[PDB]
């Protein structure tokens, strides 16, 4: 009874990759092989492409990470021991309300603003990198727009809502426990963030993404004895694996997808999980002061 959960016998060949124009930068990384990764998936590692947008994104991101880490280490007076003790509790806090959207003093949130700007720039440059890498390989840019949804949520959390409130004071800090505490206090300040309906939609789409990527993973693993793992080939030439995958769900559920359209569902659930989340974040504080009172007004709560 085999399951295609682990690859008992592996194959290793001469590393090769799809052809790209040389460009200013070559492929970098001297590809190698790994055993556990080949047990769970492919064994080859790299090479990683590092173009102009890749260099720009890496430099901006590294600057942001170094600024954040330097501030975290400085907050505990440069003690490696006490840095270890408080690492989770350490955080680069955003500037206070009084400074508006302008530059705060470095100790009072200027470093947070500089780090956030550099991180935003690196994330956007990484988005451009995904777009350009997809276009270079003569492929579509679905990954870029799926990423753009996540960037929308990130910018709504960090920049857009501060713009609307005219204030970075309620932005999320750069810390492990501090950003969870920001989540908790954001929910408390605005009345039981469960009563945010776009939060409910985002949770529905997150649950649906997990559900869908368990359903689809189990379906492809169930038809992997029939060439079902080779999804694009079953999309261009429908084999019996795709037919049985469709008929299983048609018989158990009443309807079914295509090998191509199931990944459209997969794309859209993931994208909507963050799109509705960004909308719900942009709506709180600006339009809806208290989500519990909005729910009471609109029939979500028994009106105490």
């Amino acid at each position: 009874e085999y399951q295609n959960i682990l690859t008992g016998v592996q194959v290793r060949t001469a590393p090769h990759s799809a052809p790209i124009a040389k460009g200013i930068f070559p492929r970098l990384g001297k590809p190698g092989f790994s055993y556990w990764l080949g047990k769970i998936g492919d064994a080859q590692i790299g090479p990683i492409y590092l173009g102009t947008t890749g260099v720009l994104s890496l430099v901006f991101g590294f600057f942001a990470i170094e600024i954040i880490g330097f501030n975290l280490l400085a907050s505990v007076n440069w003690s490696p021991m006490e840095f270890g003790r408080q690492f989770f509790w350490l955080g680069l806090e955003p500037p206070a309300a009084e400074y508006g959207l302008g530059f705060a003093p470095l100790a009072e949130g200027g470093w947070w603003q500089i780090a956030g700007f550099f991180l935003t720039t690196s994330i956007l440059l990484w988005w451009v990198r995904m777009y350009r890498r997809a276009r270079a390989l003569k492929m579509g840019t679905h990954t870029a727009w799926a990423f753009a949804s996540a960037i929308f949520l990130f910018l709504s959390l960090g920049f857009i809502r501060p713009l609307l409130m005219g204030n970075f004071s309620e932005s999320v800090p750069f810390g492990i426990f501090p950003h969870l505490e920001w989540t908790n206090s954001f929910s408390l300040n605005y009345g039981n963030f469960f009563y945010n309906p776009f939060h409910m939609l985002s949770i529905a789409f997150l649950y649906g993404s997990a559900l869908l990527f368990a359903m689809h993973g189990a379906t492809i693993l169930a038809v992997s004895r029939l060439g079902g793992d080779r999804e694009v080939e079953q999309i261009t030439d429908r084999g019996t694996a795709a037919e049985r995958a469709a008929l299983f769900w048609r018989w158990t559920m009443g309807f079914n997808a295509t090998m191509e359209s199931i990944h459209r569902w997969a794309w859209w659930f993931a994208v909507l999980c963050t799109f509705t989340g960004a909308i719900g974040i942009l709506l709180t504080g600006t339009v809806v002061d208290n989500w519990f009172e909005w729910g009471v007004k609109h029939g979500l709560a028994p009106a105490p």
């Binding site: 200013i24 930068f25 102009t52 260099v55 430099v59 901006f60 600057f63 530059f103 603003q113 500089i114």
Partner: protein, 47 residues
């Protein structure tokens, strides 16, 4: 010196140099903006 370009590709050298200089200059301007003395827009008094 004259053969520094025999080890580094001039395109890669120029791109890396421009990226690093741009990011460093942006950082320096941001840091000066975050000061009571060198924020040329807020224009706080020296004294």
């Amino acid at each position: 010196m004259w053969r520094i370009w025999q080890l580094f590709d001039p395109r890669q050298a120029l791109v890396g140099l421009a990226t690093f200089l741009f990011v460093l200059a942006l950082l320096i301007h941001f840091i000066l903006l975050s000061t009571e003395r060198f924020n040329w827009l807020e224009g706080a008094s020296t004294k």
